[PDB]
């Protein structure tokens, strides 16, 4: 209990958020 939450604060977290969102959009439009 700590790092899991800190990840949201740290920059690394945000950097990953964009990636996850990117794949989602691409996958959604792709088929």
From Swiss-Prot:
Transmembrane stretches, start-end: 5-26
Protein name as it appears in the record: Insulin receptor-related protein beta chain
Organism whose genome encodes this protein: Homo sapiens
Name of the encoding gene: INSRR
Portion of the full sequence shown: 918 to 948 of 1297
């Amino acid at each position: 209990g700590g790092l899991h939450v800190l990840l949201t604060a740290t920059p690394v977290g945000l950097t990953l958020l964009i990636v996850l969102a990117a794949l989602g959009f691409f996958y959604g439009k792709k088929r």
